[PDB]
From Swiss-Prot:
Keyword Signal listed: yes
Record comment regarding domains: Composed of a N-terminal A-region and a number of B-repeats depending on the strain. At the C-terminal end are features required for surface targeting and covalently anchoring to the peptidoglycan. The collagen binding activity is located in the A-region.
Residue numbers of the full-length protein present here: 533 to 905 of 1183
Coiled coil region boundaries: none
Molecular function in Gene Ontology: collagen binding
Marked site (Autocatalyzes isopeptide 818-902 formation) residue numbers: E347
Site (Autocatalyzes isopeptide 728-805 formation): E256
UniProt name for this protein: Collagen adhesin
Main location per the UniProt record: secreted
Subunit structure: Interacts (via N-terminus) with type I collagen. Interacts with host C1QA.
GO cellular component: extracellular region; peptidoglycan-based cell wall
B repeat locations: 1-187, 188-373
Amino acid sequence: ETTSSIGEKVWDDKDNQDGKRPEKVSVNLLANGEKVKTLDVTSETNWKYEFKDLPKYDEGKKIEYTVTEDHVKDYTTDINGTTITNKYTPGETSATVTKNWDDNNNQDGKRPTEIKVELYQDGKATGKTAILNESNNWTHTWTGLDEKAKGQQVKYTVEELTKVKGYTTHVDNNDMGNLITTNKYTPETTSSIGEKVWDDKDNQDGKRPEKVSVNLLANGEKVKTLDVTSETNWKYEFKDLPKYDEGKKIEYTVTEDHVKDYTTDINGTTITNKYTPGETSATVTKNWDDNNNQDGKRPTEIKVELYQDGKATGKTAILNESNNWTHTWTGLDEKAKGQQVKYTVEELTKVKGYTTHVDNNDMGNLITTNKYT
């Protein structure tokens, strides 16, 4: 899904009476406070401009676009949406500052609600301040600033007064028309490690496979898979995993794709497989796709039932936050008559506002996802 950003440049100088209007201006496109594209506007296009083929989302989040203009001598600038007004003001200008949050869309929810900055002149604080926050799209333009401080051009810069904890700060002071303050933060990470233990009399019957596939689930969603073999002594480790999602701590679990003739039991990150000729287990997990229940319509519990070859077996389970929305049944026959049985899950409880979809590809990892529509 792409987008288009269009606007125009309007002159407020009495029709260029003093004939001091430049031939063009340079407008900058900022994506969430970051300069990603510049463009020259002239009378060729009747001072109109357009940025097309723009990504509407980055990291699955809506991109907040804004425009700034590089400083024009003796002109003061005003930005209203995409409409840039430059009014002729001999000897005076404006200065624009935008705040760039480089912290992965606030993944760890550590971003403050607002920050204050102050404009400096040739190095001395001016007393001109600004409070940047969501309301003003983290931008602010100061007006009526002196270009010359007695026979010599003056340089303006910005400085962040607020001390954002955990963040680092860098300021871009190259053009007073587009000053940018960047606050960087590196999101926390974790790792999950475990082992698989075989309970088959040290492979008495040589039925043990060469490897198993363990799945890593993030809040019920499968995000990575590992083939575990004896090469690592049946030990696995998932590294550099994001610790939070939208300010919330991610609940990580593991499941194992079905192994022929073994009954799986999962305790934490320890996966145990017991040799049980003709019998296995089935594992279910509920996936809540509703932006971490921000709208608060998620039920506190649901019920699912096991089905073999399409018929209700009567084996049910209540999934909730206490058992991590996951359950494993044991004692399931792999064969009936001479053919292999098929196992699927059914969500019994119908939850309003959500649409359900069930993945029955592998009985060792059945996943019921509910999308908040």
